[PDB]
Ligand SMILES: CCCCC[C@H]1O[C@@H]1[C@@H](O)/C=C\CCCCCCCC(=O)O
């Protein structure tokens with residue numbers, strides 16, 4: 001016979017729970033010693049009566065192992081020997097039963113085997129609730145990755161079974177301890193019961209507002225509307241998708257939620273009352289935000305200061321003062337943001353450097369229906385370009401690819417009259433930029449469009465303004481770019497960020513868990529990039545993009561914010577999400593086998609793109625090596641039932657509204673899976689970081705990144721034009737986001753732009769030893785080494801003086817694509833997943 005030695009590693013709840021960590025021998029671990037936790041080995045080679053592997057005797061935990069050279073923080077180890085013997089096969093999985101009442105996080109199990117076999121490792125990382133709540137014991141598998149063959153015959157039934165356990169079908173209200181993954185439409189952002197004005201359109205499951213599906217939660221429907229789901233202070237997400245933290249400071253989502261319930265009202269009581277002026281009177285009043293900070297009543301400062309997480313982040317001067325960290329944008333020069341140079345630069349290296357396009361014709365047209373501003377150009381004339389520069393015809397300019405455009409016209413046009421009827425006054429902008437010979441981009445003309453002169457047909461009511469270095473013409477031009485940036489800020493926030501990243505990824509996380517076994521090779525490749533994504537998205541539906549959320553209250557599109565992104569989703573295509581595909585689609589690059597990445601870039605000094613191509617290639621190379629390690633032929637792929645079931649569900653369900661698009665890759669080729677996995681991973685890591693981490697550094701100054709517009713362009717000589725003359729600064733302040741909203745926006749994007757101390761970066765980072773496949777382990781080490789190589793390569797670039805665009809007049813070297821970072825508001829770092 002024999003006795004297999006086992007080592008169990010877990011963490012107690014009050015080591016990861018936010019309530020406990022509020023503050024962050026004694027042996028509480030003695031509670032785990034009686035008959036509190038039992039494990040039961042399952043044979044991987046010895047099949048019982050029919051197929052199903054053979055279970056071992058139920059063994060309870062006996063003994064604390066006070067120390068291991070490899071232990072860790074907040075972790076607890078226990079010894080437990082299992083009775084085994086030659087003939088009982090090799091352990092391949094096991095069942096765990098928690099009788100403790102209080103749940104615990106099981107990290108792992110190691111086995112000092114018996115027959116000619118080395119230690120067997122199990123990486124668990126799961127919350128084990130009381131055994132009373134499941135009816136089917138929580139199962140865990142060994143370190144080995146296996147194709148859907150489910151390989152070990154005796155294990156095959158245990159594999160599909162757990163799969164069935166994860167889907168759970170679509171009925172009932174999900175509870176906190178469950179691990180069920182399923183889809184549902186966006187129908188919980190609104191509050192129809194609290195007013196017909198609070199009802200919001202259901203996004204998805206219809207032609208008009210298509211949308212990716214979100215994680216199903218089954219609360220009862222709304223009274224006033226059955227098609228709507230009841231609101232709750234607790235959105236459910238399969239347990240485990242919600243990651244805990246050892247420190248009271250890394251619970252960023254908590255900080256965001258508490259900023260939307262506690263910080264908001266209390267903050268308005270200071271305005272609604274009078275303890276603070278309602279509007280900024282000068283740029284100087286805005287700069288004081290990072291020096292002295294908003295003097296706030298003592299009463300308030302006592303509450304919005306001690307609460308968990310909101311520490312440090314909320315710089316306080318003891319009392320009253322509510323200082324803000326100075327954004328990197330005004331650290332060196334608090335005036336460079338006004339540069340046309342910096343305005344255009346941020347289009348290539350800013351918070352949203354993904355939109356710019358290369359003009360193919362002139363004047364730029366529209367994608368709108370039968371109205372005439374779509375049936376026929378914009379009002380930017382050929383005798384409006386180049387006010388002193390080179391001196392090339394518009395054709396010659398286009399011919400040598402020197403003209404670029406930032407088109408913010410179509411998405412907001414259809415909703416303009418509606419939006420202009422509120423306290424918000426906006427335009428549907430377009431701006432043309434010329435590529436100077438010095439390598440810089442310069443704004444040549446901005447076109448401010450309004451809707452319907454009369455009626456709606458031929459609703460092309462536009463006014464084009466041109467750069468002006470002098471007098472009131474510069475004040476008018478500085479307001480002109482502000483109307484564009486307000487458009488951009490909003491598109492970025494709702495589409496570039498929320499939609500192209502957060503929303504689009506959720507269906508993949510659901511589809512993956514529902515059909516790929518934890519033991520499946522592809523599951524293990526993708527999993528790290530899904531970390532905490534469903535959790536942050538749940539907070540979003542709760543306090544960000546909801547009925548009266550922060551986004552509806554802080555951005556230009558207002559209450560129509562999300563519907564519009566769903567209208568934008570109309571044009572989303574998975575395969576164009578791959579960076580090289582994106583670049584070409586926009587005319588920013590052309591296919592060229594000669595070049596270091598198969599493509600030739602227009603504007604070589606395009607930070608986001610030059611850096612991103614490196615990381616894109618790094619990711620893609622890594623996935624390819626990993627994939628071809630497991631799939632022998634293309635047929636091996638067409639035979640994978642779990643993968644095939646997974647892709648079909650993603651297409652037909654998760655993104656069900658596009659299930660009929662002809663650009664969906666067929667999982668018939670190994671090359672198509674590499675591509676699909678590369679894009680997903682690219683989206684979850686580098687894309688989100690590139691779009692999410694430069695929010696405060698650039699936008700932490702409302703002047704540089706305004707969120708909403710409250711005034712139309714002052715006219716000819718009216719008293720609005722006369723004040724622009726006498727006081728331009730005040731004319732600017734009255735046109736952009738008011739003081740109260742500026743305070744909200746800064747509070748939120750300062751958290752959003754942070755790195756938690758326990759962030760797992762793309763930088764070859766995982767949790768423990770995910771696999772026993774040595775070959776994969778090595779490929780993963782190569783990936784990591786190439787990343788470190790890349791980081792140095794990019795830092796050198798930031799030193800190259802011939803690449804002004806990486807720094808601009810603001811002297812802000814582009815570091816958003818550097819793989820590593822230390823923690824906090826670092827203008828750098830690429831997390832494995834969308835974690836905030
Ligand atoms: C605990 C933190 C959770 C974060 C939740 C985030 O997902 C939400 C996000 O996608 C949705 C909208 C963010 C909009 C910000 C865009 C501002 C950019 C404008 C500029 O400054 O120039």
Ligand SMILES: [Fe+3]
Pocket residue numbers: 497502688692752834836
């Ligand atoms: Fe984000």
